[PDB]
Amino acid sequence: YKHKCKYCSKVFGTDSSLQIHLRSHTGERPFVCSVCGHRFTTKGNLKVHFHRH
Amino acid sequence: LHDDDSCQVIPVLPQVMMILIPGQTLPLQLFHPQEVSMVRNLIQKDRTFAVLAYREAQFGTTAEIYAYREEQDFGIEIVKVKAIGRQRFKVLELRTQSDGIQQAKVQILPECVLPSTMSAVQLESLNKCQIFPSKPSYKWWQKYQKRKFHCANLTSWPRWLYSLYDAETLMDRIKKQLREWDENLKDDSLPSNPIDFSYRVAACLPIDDVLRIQLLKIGSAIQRLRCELDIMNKCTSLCCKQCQETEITTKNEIFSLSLCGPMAAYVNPHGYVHETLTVYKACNLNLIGRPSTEHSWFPGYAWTVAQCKICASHIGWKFTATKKDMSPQKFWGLTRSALLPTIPDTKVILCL
Amino acid sequence: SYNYVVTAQKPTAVNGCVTGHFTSAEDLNLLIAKNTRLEIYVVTAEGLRPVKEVGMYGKIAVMELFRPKGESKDLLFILTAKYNACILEYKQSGESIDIITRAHGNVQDRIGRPSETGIIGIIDPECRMIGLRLYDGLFKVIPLDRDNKELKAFNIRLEELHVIDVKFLYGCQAPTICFVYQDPQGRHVKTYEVSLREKEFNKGPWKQENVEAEASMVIAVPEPFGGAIIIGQESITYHNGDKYLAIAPPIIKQSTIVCHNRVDPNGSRYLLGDMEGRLFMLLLEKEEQMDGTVTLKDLRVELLGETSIAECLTYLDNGVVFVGSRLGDSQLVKLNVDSNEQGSYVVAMETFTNLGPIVDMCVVDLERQGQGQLVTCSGAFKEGSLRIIRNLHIRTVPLYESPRKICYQEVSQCFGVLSSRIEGTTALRPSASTQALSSSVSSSKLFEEVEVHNLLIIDQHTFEVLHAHQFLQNEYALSLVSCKLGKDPNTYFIVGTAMVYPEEAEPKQGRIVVFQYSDGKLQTVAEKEVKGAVYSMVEFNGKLLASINSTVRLYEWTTEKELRTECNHYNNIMALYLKTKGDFILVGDLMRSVLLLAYKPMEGNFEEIARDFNPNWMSAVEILDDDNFLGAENAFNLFVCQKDSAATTDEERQHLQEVGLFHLGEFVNVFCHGSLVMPTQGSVLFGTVNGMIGLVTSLSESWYNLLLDMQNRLNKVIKSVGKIEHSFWRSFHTERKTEPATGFIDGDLIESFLDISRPKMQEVVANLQYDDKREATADDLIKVVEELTRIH
Ligand SMILES: O=C1CC[C@H](N2Cc3c(OCc4ccc(CN5CCOCC5)cc4)cccc3C2=O)C(=O)N1
Ligand SMILES: [Zn+2]
Ligand SMILES: [Zn+2]
Ligand SMILES: [Zn+2]
């Protein structure tokens, strides 16, 4: 479904519910791999490591 | 329960990439409506869907749903479902339908039930002595081999050969090394049926995917036992599946922190299952980040992402202790999909 | 492939012996079961006189005589291993002797697990039912009323699923069965009453819990006393209601009693045979009371003497007993009132040669006349012997130990025989190894009952053991080969061994020893250590092929008289069977995995040509030609597979297609190319466990289609004992499968064409087609079967 958090890949029902959670990823490495817990600097870096699973 | 060699059209989950052993538990967590409604309709029917064996699949196993839970959190309906493998099969035709799901025309394979080797050579005057008093030792086995295989003097092979094909003797030899990986289980826990026993060890060994397929396609259960025992005796070193040659850990490091054996299936905060093998020492691993206790599969321990030193692929997590009164204060949790059983060099080949 | 199998020698082992009045009420008969055959003799004062021998389309599993009320003579019930039930009556009209079938059926249930203690078949003393124990937890009852001609039956659930032995009790009000069973608590004896009207089980008169740990036999005592005698390893006990007696004689502890027979119709005397040939007499000492009753006072066991390792015992008359043996020769023995000079009351009368079990054989041209002679390793333990079979004239060379492998070395005019003897350890008896003219023991340093293996050098003329070479301690000799190697002009004896230790399951070390017999001793011309068991060896064009566990390896003979590894080929199956033809190499394991390897002479390595994995217990294998391969598998079946003729894909060429399936009815232990004689191509002899020697020859497609037609036509004019059909008998059989036969022709049924009436010979040749395409006159087919009777 849509309304998916770009950092942890959790899907929410409404875009409203997306934003209220978006500021739990406070930090320099907010992108987390939903498979192993690897944290990354940018979204593209998380994508490359994700597609190596 | 389908008939042997019969045909069935069984639905398939398009996001289930896994080799399923009969009897092995398959944990699922579905978000999509087509996947969710398909689970519910199986419950009010046969609860049987197909888990294909790999994207070209040739064999596979049917899965029966034995658990179902519903969570309506964050406006998204979460459906978690546990299944158990049942019957092996060979795929005849794969046909994708309207939604993301697909149907599979499928032929059920039969579980080859073979009699004893001496079922044909035993003399009827000694048939009355074929039942032995049950096991109360290593001299009891020297009598079991002598008594059960006495009629080998009527064939061209000795008794010690028929033991290597004796189902009951091979399970005990596998039980020995399995207990070295777990200080619990005891003589029970593992099933007594050789067919059920072989499928449990198939799902218990830390073996890669192409080795799991070979155990599925092995016909007789006696052959499945010999090949399994061959893997434990020869493949003593576990290397990184990616770079093939980087040895992560060996066989003597395996132990059981969780009572459910040295390799239980755990779920991560996003539904991904991880058949995690717990070992004491590990090699050629880089720690990523600092320890964390969030969603730890072992209470009292903190996990840290561990990656291969050479190929930089994910191998598992290192678990350190958050308390002093806990032993071991450190251990490694290596996921299965990252390891590759390797025969250390001196050409050794797995034998059926 | 189109193949043709004919019996060259009928099974010789004895698996059953009952006495009674089958031919006439006055006559005393002895009925002997030889696997697929049934011999009927009339017991005379002189000895035994043959009356009629018939064959069956099944392996006789239970053979018992009985006489229901209102019947002239005794009737014969026979059940085959394929569950063909039949009641048979003897009938003679002057000289036409025929075994008529009074009733027949198939008692096989689709469900049920075949019991661990085998098929048991018992009959009520008053003949009102037939009790069968085929599956665990079930008991099939066949009412013995003369309206059950199809042998309809019903089952009764058995809460005791591990039954050891069961018998019908004598002198009981209702039909009572008495059996011994085992459960987690121990071994117990329990009795049930059968109601042929309620079709269920009623409470039995008595039961005794905690019987002997290894109680194995139930002997029903006749109505003078009733009850049952339970015999195990340590005890002989008598039970009846609340009457108990028990003895533990030290004279029956060295072995286990495995067979019994009643001597007097009152159950006062019993004969007991053990696993080693001993013969005991179980006497029930009775005490005569004053009110007309006779009580049972004590049980007494005395050792009578030694016979052949007895599978079945039966007392005849005038102290004459028939000892039916599977391992060795069956015999008629005479018992005396007084012991002889060595304390034995048993003296031999007649001996019937038993070729089984044939564990190895070889075709030899002894008299150079191109005739062909079969020399086999037969017997087990003290019954071991060599048998020289001719055209059949059988010579017997006893060895008093177990012979395993044989090979003939013509240059030495001698036979090389592998053997094992059962034993600081001392021999139990003088054996061929202990009585050799010269004796050597091996030295290497490279590496209760115990096995001692020896290579015996046996003269081709006198058959005296010239030399006995004792192998290493804990060494198990597996292979033996006689061949010339490389450039060496000497012919050698090659032996492949394995180091077996009760602690290690799989062998990790073995030897390949090169022997030479030049003067009167054996010289060890170098050896080679291998890291596994040398299961098989074959000469491969001046080189030595060998199996080491899962490894096939080609060895070369250097000028230093040593073995040097040339090339290896590692298999994923245990290289157990090894047969070669030219540069082709056939490999097989115990689980019917067939592997074809080709040695590439220009590359100096092996190549895998084809493969076929069908999990089943294989016992022997052999190469028919460069494409077709024959083997033996469970249960008592034969099979042929071939390299696929459709040479389209590389995939398809690596698959061996199954082309022949056949229920031989015998357990083949060895295949051997050769013939006993001076149309068809190929000649493969095979020896079996029951002592049967058979032929395997390949037919053209033109003949095969003809003999298959004559098969279905000769099966319509031949009466089968029990009304069993050849199609059912010859169909590939295992507990999981039932599939008709293919690619095989039963020569025995074809040869029965020369022995049928001419009015019936025309019945089968009518509407026949012979591709010489005209019709087949009755005389064209005696010509084809006359030529097919010449292969053996
Ligand atoms: O033993 C082990 C080894 C490591 C393994 N972990 C931890 C982990 C994460 O760990 C950080 C984290 C954990 C839990 C959360 C909670 N959320 C849930 C989703 O919605 C938002 C809130 C968030 C972040 C984050 C992503 C993946 C994994 C992963 O596979 C594991 O589970 N147990
Ligand atoms: Zn998020
Ligand atoms: Zn990751
Ligand atoms: Zn790596």
**Among A32, A39, A49, A50, which residue has the most ligand 1 atoms within 8 Å of its CB, making it the best to mutate?**
A32
CA atoms of C234 and B133, how far apart (whole Å): 14
Q: What is the DSSP letter of B152?
A: G
Architecture of domain A1-53: 2-Layer Sandwich (3.30)
**Among B31, B257, B268, B318, which residue has the most ligand 1 atoms within 8 Å of its CB, making it the best to mutate?**
B268
Give the nearest partner residue to B270 out of A17, A34, A53, using CB atoms: A34
Question: Using CB atoms within 10 A of its CB, is residue C217 exposed (0-12), middle (13-18) or buried (19+)?
Answer: buried
C11 upstream amide cis, omega within 30 of 0: no
CA atoms of C671 and C694, how far apart (whole Å): 10
Distances (CA, A) of C236 to B130, C191, C298, C484: 19, 18, 11, 58
For tokens 């062909």, what's the residue? C372
**Alpha helix ranges (H) inside B104-193:** 139-148, 159-164, 167-180
* DSSP β-bridge partners for residue C722: none
Question: Using CB atoms within 10 A of its CB, is residue C747 exposed (0-12), middle (13-18) or buried (19+)?
Answer: buried
Nearest CA to ligand 1 atom 10: A37
Judged by CB atoms closer than 8 Å, whether chains meet at B155 and C505 is answered as no
Judged by CB atoms closer than 8 Å, whether chains meet at B305 and A52 is answered as no
Nearest CA to ligand 1 atom 19: B269
C250 upstream amide cis, omega within 30 of 0: no
CA atoms of C277 and C381, how far apart (whole Å): 10
Nearest CA to ligand 1 atom 32: B268
Q: Which ligand is nearest to the CA of A9?
A: 2
Site residues for ligand 1, CB cut-off 6 Å = A 8, 10, 32, 34-37; B 268-270, 294-297, 303, 317
- For B194, the 3-state DSSP assignment is helix
Please provide residue B195's backbone torsions phi and psi, each rounded to the nearest 5 degrees: -65, -45
CA atoms of B303 and B317, how far apart (whole Å): 6
- For B337, the 3-state DSSP assignment is helix
CA dihedral sign, ordered C737, C741, C743, C746: positive
**For C275-428, where are the E strands, in sequence order?**
278-288, 294-306, 310-315, 320-325, 330-335, 346-352, 360-364, 373-378, 385-389, 394-398, 402-409, 414-422
Distances (CA, A) of C562 to C440, C470, C513, C526, C559: 22, 22, 10, 6, 7
Q: Which ligand is nearest to the CA of B273?
A: 1
Please provide residue B194's backbone torsions phi and psi, each rounded to the nearest 5 degrees: -60, -35
CA atoms of C721 and C37, how far apart (whole Å): 10
CA atoms of B120 and C2, how far apart (whole Å): 27
- For B103, the 3-state DSSP assignment is strand
Is there a contact between C388 and C692 (Cβ–Cβ < 8 Å)? no
Buried b (16+ CB within 10 A) or exposed e, C408-431: bbeebebbbbbbbbbeeeeeeeeb
State the DSSP H helix or E strand holding residue C619, giving kind and residue range, or none if neither. strand C618-623
Give the rounded distance of the alpha carbon of B315 from its chain centre.
19
B3 touches chain C (CB under 8 A): no
Tell me the one-letter amino acid at C646.
A
For tokens 């389309």, what's the residue? C57
- For B165, the 3-state DSSP assignment is coil
CA atoms of C215 and C235, how far apart (whole Å): 8
**Alpha helix ranges (H) inside C178-252:** none
Instruction: Find which of B161, B166, B226 to mutate to test the C interface (most C CBs within 10 Å of its CB).
Output: B161
Give the largest Cα separation in chain B, rounded.
Answer: 74
CA atoms of C166 and C186, how far apart (whole Å): 17
Neighbour order of strands in the sheet with C414-422: C402-409, C414-422, C451-459, C465-470, C438-441
Is there a contact between C359 and C377 (Cβ–Cβ < 8 Å)? yes
Please provide residue C577's backbone torsions phi and psi, each rounded to the nearest 5 degrees: -100, 140
C58 touches chain B (CB under 8 A): no
Give distance in angstroms: CA of A47 to centre of ligand 4: 19
Among candidate residues C484, C486, C560, the one with its CA nearest the CA of residue C528? C560
Tell me the one-letter amino acid at B327.
S
Give the nearest partner residue to B31 out of A11, A37, A52, using CB atoms: A11
Q: Which fold has domain B247-340?
A: 2.170.150
Pairing of strands B285-292, C475-484: unpaired
The experimental technique behind this entry is X-ray
- The dihedral region occupied by A20, where left means phi > 0, alpha psi between -120 and 50, and beta the remainder, is alpha
Is there a contact between C195 and C202 (Cβ–Cβ < 8 Å)? yes
What are the structure tokens assigned to C240, written together?
């009846």
Among candidate residues B268, B314, B318, B272, the one with its CA nearest the CA of residue B292? B318
- What residues have CB less than 8 Å from B188, skipping those under 6 apart? none
CA atoms of C418 and C430, how far apart (whole Å): 17
In chain C the first and final C-alpha atoms are separated, in Å, by 20
Question: Using CB atoms within 10 A of its CB, is residue C72 exposed (0-12), middle (13-18) or buried (19+)?
Answer: exposed
Which residues 106-165 in chain B show a CB within 8 A of chain C?
112-115, 117, 119-131, 133-134, 138, 142, 146, 153-158, 160-165
Give distance in angstroms: CA of B288 to centre of ligand 4: 15
This structure's resolution (Å) is 3.0
Distances (CA, A) of B229 to B55, B197, B253, C508, C533: 30, 12, 18, 16, 19
Output B96-103 pairs: Cβ under 8 A, ≥24 positions apart. Answer: B99/B34, B100/B14, B100/B32, B100/B34, B100/B35, B101/B11, B101/B12, B101/B13, B101/B14, B101/B34, B101/B35, B101/B38, B102/B11, B102/B12, B102/B14, B103/B9, B103/B10, B103/B11, B103/B12
Among candidate residues B158, B169, B153, the one with its CA nearest the CA of residue B116? B169
Identify the structural domains of chain C with CATH numbers, from first to last.
Answer: 3-352 (2.130.10.10), 358-703 (2.130.10.10), 704-789 (1.10.150.910)
Residues in chain A with CB shorter than 8 Å from the CB of B74 are: 10-13, 17
CA atoms of C670 and C690, how far apart (whole Å): 13
CA atoms of B339 and B335, how far apart (whole Å): 7
Residues in chain B: 352
Question: What HEC string does B234-302 produce?
Answer: HCCEEEECCCCCCEEEEHHHECCCCCCCCEEEEECCCCCEEEEEEECCCCCEEEEEEEECCCCCCCCEE
For tokens 């149907």, what's the residue? B103
CA atoms of B231 and B170, how far apart (whole Å): 13
In chain B the first and final C-alpha atoms are separated, in Å, by 29
Instruction: Find which of B76, B308, B335 to mutate to test the A interface (most A CBs within 10 Å of its CB).
Output: B76
Task: Tell me whether residue B240 is annotated as binding.
Answer: yes
Task: Tell me whether residue B140 is annotated as binding.
Answer: no
Question: Residue C37: how many CB atoms within 10 A of its CB?
Answer: 17
CA atoms of B15 and C769, how far apart (whole Å): 63
Residues in chain B with CB shorter than 8 Å from the CB of C184 are: 134
Instruction: Find which of B209, B311, B314 to mutate to test the A interface (most A CBs within 10 Å of its CB).
Output: B314
Please provide residue C406's backbone torsions phi and psi, each rounded to the nearest 5 degrees: -140, 145
- The set of chains that have 3 or more CB pairs under 8 A with C is B
Please provide residue C215's backbone torsions phi and psi, each rounded to the nearest 5 degrees: -70, 125
State the DSSP H helix or E strand holding residue B204, giving kind and residue range, or none if neither. helix B194-204
C619 touches chain B (CB under 8 A): yes
C399 touches chain B (CB under 8 A): no
Q: What is the DSSP letter of B27?
A: E
What are the structure tokens assigned to C540, written together?
């491969």
Neighbour order of strands in the sheet with C693-698: C668-673, C681-688, C693-698, C3-9, C744-746
Judged by CB atoms closer than 8 Å, whether chains meet at B75 and A14 is answered as yes
C635 upstream amide cis, omega within 30 of 0: yes
CA atoms of C323 and C342, how far apart (whole Å): 20
Question: Residue B168: how many CB atoms within 10 A of its CB?
Answer: 15
Name the CA dihedral angle for C110, C114, C120, C122, rounded to a multiple of 10 degrees: -30
CA atoms of B146 and B161, how far apart (whole Å): 12
CA atoms of C271 and C336, how far apart (whole Å): 14
Is there a contact between C251 and C238 (Cβ–Cβ < 8 Å)? no
Is there a contact between B116 and B162 (Cβ–Cβ < 8 Å)? no
CA atoms of C296 and C245, how far apart (whole Å): 9
Q: Which fold has domain B6-108?
A: 2.30.130
Q: For residue C773, how many C-alpha atoms fall within 13 Å in the half-sphere facing its CB?
A: 7
- For C387, the 3-state DSSP assignment is strand
Nearest CA to ligand 1 atom 26: A37
Concatenated DSSP letters of B50-61: EEEE-----EEE
CA dihedral sign, ordered C587, C589, C590, C592: negative
- Ligand 1, residue B296: give the atom nearest the CA: 1
**Among A6, A12, A26, A36, which residue has the most ligand 1 atoms within 8 Å of its CB, making it the best to mutate?**
A36
Task: Tell me whether residue B283 is annotated as binding.
Answer: no
Distances (CA, A) of B138 to B80, B145, C476: 47, 11, 21
State the DSSP H helix or E strand holding residue C216, giving kind and residue range, or none if neither. none
Distances (CA, A) of C595 to B277, C552, C627, C637: 37, 11, 12, 20
